[PDB]
Amino acid sequence: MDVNPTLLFLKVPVQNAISTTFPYTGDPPYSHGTGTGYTMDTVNRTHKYSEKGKWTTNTETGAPQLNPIDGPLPEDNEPSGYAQTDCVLEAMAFLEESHPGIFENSCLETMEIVQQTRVDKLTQGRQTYDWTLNRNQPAATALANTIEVFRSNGLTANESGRLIDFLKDVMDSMDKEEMEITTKQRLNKRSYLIRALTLNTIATPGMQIRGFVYFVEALARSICEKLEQSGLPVGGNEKKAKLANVVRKMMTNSQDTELSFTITGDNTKWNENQNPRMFLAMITYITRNQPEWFRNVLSIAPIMFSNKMARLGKGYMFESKSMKLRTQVPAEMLANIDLKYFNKSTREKIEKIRPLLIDGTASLSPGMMMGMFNMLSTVLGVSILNLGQKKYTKTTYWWDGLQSSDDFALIVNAPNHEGIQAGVDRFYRTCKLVGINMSKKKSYINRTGTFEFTSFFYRYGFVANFSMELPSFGVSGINESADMSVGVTVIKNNMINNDLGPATAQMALQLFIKDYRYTYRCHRGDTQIQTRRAFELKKLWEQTRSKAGLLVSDGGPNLYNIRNLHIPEVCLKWELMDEDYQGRLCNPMNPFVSHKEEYDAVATTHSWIPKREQMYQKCCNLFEKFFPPVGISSMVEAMVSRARIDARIDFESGRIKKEEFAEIMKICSTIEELR
Amino acid sequence: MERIKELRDLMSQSRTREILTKTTVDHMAIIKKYTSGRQEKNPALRMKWMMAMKYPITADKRIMEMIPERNEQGQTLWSKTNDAGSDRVMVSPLAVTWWNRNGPTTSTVHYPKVYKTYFEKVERL
Amino acid sequence: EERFEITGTMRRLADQSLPPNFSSLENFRAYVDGFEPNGCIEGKLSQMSKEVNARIEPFLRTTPRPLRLPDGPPCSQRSKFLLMDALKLSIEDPSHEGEGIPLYDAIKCMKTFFGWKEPNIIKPHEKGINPNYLLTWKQVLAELQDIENEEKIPRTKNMKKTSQLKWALGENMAPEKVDFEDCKDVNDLKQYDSDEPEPRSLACWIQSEFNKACELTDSSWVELDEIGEDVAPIEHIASMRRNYFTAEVSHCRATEYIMKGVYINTALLNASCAAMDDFQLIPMISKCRTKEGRRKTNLYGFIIKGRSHLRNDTDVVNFVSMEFSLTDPRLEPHKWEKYCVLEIGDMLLRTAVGQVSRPMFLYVRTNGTSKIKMKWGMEMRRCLLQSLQQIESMIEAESSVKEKDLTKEFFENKSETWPIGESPKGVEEGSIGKVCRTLLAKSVFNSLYASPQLEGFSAESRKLLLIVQALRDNLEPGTFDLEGLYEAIEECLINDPWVLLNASWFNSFLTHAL
């Protein structure tokens, strides 16, 4: 008998055991696909979908820039960047009609935000391009570097605190012809501007551009918040509802005759198509009848993205067979380089992009880099779902559904089959007019009752229950006291938010405790396992009357289960503790705590702090010149002692003269007089 | 000739001077160990890495007056080692357990009322 | 009154970042400000080509064809350590419980075997210096006896940097970086040719390897820590699910592979950061309680580590992997492409047929790994969670329809049998226990043979499955570019034996599913 797990689906429906079709559950050990060759394919394909549009030369950048929008309608089904301003605004107009006040009100709440928001906020985030040192770096370090330049150049408004003032400096920085940083390093206005508008490897953006992207997504949030169809930014179980709602809406009205089909949606090349200029058109229509200052700050992000440049990482690696060499050609001089070094597939990719290549960066006016305007792009998506109401269709077919960035789910109703087919086409084509290209490959359609949306698999009213990304249920590496609280908190939170099943949480708890005890050598007192702590913990175990009192870090039993996980361990076991044990555990005269004034922990002896240069390496390398020594002796008097021994052994065997022996003994007494 | 002339150069810089006269040959391996776990950058390992060491935990120097140097089995509980900022010393997790079985007992009647915010989660269950 | 302004360099960008026709942000602003809708969409819909459509090819029981698996020479074993072929020298270590010293655990195991032959090569590595693989094994045996020469016995062993080891670990095979200003013109200098990975055909062994993964052993391979007494009703149901599963998975081979994963990758990472520039010997150890229940240590073989000055998570550690086996490499040589197998001694095996003398082999191969791939192997216990959650999620789901928890029925109805296999007669069902181990093996192999090819095939095939499910639900399923979906699935089927079996498993299902 040959085992084939997939044969389960002969008995179990696929939605029930969909859990078995996710191979990893966790980030795998490769995530390959971010080469220099991969960046140039994004740059090419971004232009290839948008290639009939108007080419302009940028005055400030001096960069070839494609503008596909208000361009020629597609006559094929290939992805089109050719959006239509009149269509977008109309979609956004009919949204504000269908949700009266949505924009005005959402602007009022965002005008509250933009002022109150602090520069502090900008330090939170992933890798960022640091234009100060022309490298990728941590977010907080990239800002410290950027304010250090803005401090050196007359741009001290950032040091007021609020973010809007840091932007005011970023604005004034563009107008300045010189840009100087004491690292003195000098950038002309053109070279500065390239780096201010750079995306570096898909690719992270500069610190200048990031500021504005927040306030836009902030506005895009307040909108999404007010829309039922938007699947962002709502929580775990809160979202499963939205799936139930949209079916229940389209299936209770539906009489005997009226058909209903759900299409499991996924949009193709989402980022490479829809153009920054279109987002500017959206923002300006939302912020009509609003103050100029608010209109402006929000307008800045799309503008920068329409003028942006994509750096091609580092470059390509070469290799000589016979000679046994290898060399790394950078991106900067990949334009001014010979093509006969490269292969057949790589040449064409460089020959296509070279027209766009300006100062070692490729101009990219159309499209975007992944997950940047997630929320705003969702508004646009919803505005097309919005146009499926009986009124806007003006036909016997109508539609509704759910959208979150590129993923969507669409329910089309009509009195007959041809009606459904029509309603689908009308959605598919209305989508093309705003740069949204449904993926024919990825997508499918079936009678309403089953579908997928954001990997929630709906089947006749039930969505399958499994966590799709489990976190490291191991130790957190703070100390005994904290890690327990964190680890137990991490599981509870993964049950309520991430839809983690109980039996799995119990085993998750077991594997944590196992790791916890191994890490901190704090195996239960009654067990026989040997560590350094085994003795101390057993002496405490024997001493202690009520052992259920003892914390896991004191060789106590694990009392946690589903119900407890919210309680801190110290509280949980508080009644069961011996008077003297508790007396010591919490005595804040103890030498381990320091202070005693998102995890909840009582301060005990377990709340301890573990241990935390070119001057350390210099001393260690010189020690190797002496020993290619006694344990208690210091470095200098085990170096000065080895010198006099080699001095008097090389004097006997006759290696150094009387002159070179007297010189060593003289210097060996100058080192001893500094000690 | 060149290596002993170089040692006189490093003892003229008063920062490199105070790493040569303080540090011992035994306590070079202990300085190098925990920097091999900072390359790991994953804190879960960095902890497992440190718990392997004899004395990973830091404490006030008053511990040396409070708990003994060795326990009944003759295990060393702390060491007179150099810590970064001040006159804190290095301590084995044995010492924490030792304290929790032989330490001084203060009266913990105020702890249900100091941590009331925490303790109230138990009352509902 | 807050006032933020666009001027200078920004205004010229603002004016250039508009639709065509508009030469001025203020001009455009005014267009939008005073915009009112005028059936612009309804209009441009009629203007657009009718060739731009989403016509629905209906998915019938006739439309889907079996996936096409590639042709080529048979696929090779690419796992770090041996799986079903692996062999272990075991000691019973009762009195000493808890974390010991691996070096000595190995030597103690080694000393239980008194059958070592003069080692000779049986099936060489076509693309390698085979005499070096033999010298390395002799060096291990040699340097292990040299510890019993040392005045004070060492914690770990560092192999002497011989020619054969320097070779195997790739020492001085990285060429020197030469500034392109200096080697400007070189007449054999081409880029790192990322060649089309030559396609391989699905061999039998991968299925054999997996069949053996689903089997039980005479050894508990996991011992999980305690848990709070059950109180709430959910806690009683939870513990029931867990324990029933934990019971049938306890002794499953897959779980041995999980432990082999953890111990080896753990020991390799600790060495990679401890003895950075030493060629450390790293014994391949696991532990289990016997069927009677005594703590038993196992030695599978050795790994010699290269230089490991690791800065990044991607940075590589070259290692050699000498692993004991009873399996003759001449039976399925296509498997052992990457391996040079020696014949290093004779075992006696007290089987059903009295006792039989068999030869002992040593599957030696060159190999590498990174902090990320080691961590991956160290976190392989998650396979247990992944496996339990699949079982737990099904129960949760099958219970929803009835409204009552089916935890008891599933596990206790010993008549209730799940389809999980095929045989010459046809589709065979098994126990819920067989399903647990089968689902565990899947999670483990998904880890062991983790590839981007798998990621892809998993994601794209999922769609085809869900479509087929809709066809079985009689929900009039329809596709938009079904030929496009197949091309995307088949694009993933190149040479990976695991992804190829999963595709064979699909075709196998798709025939019965209709």
Ligand SMILES: [Mg+2]
């Ligand atoms: Mg989808």
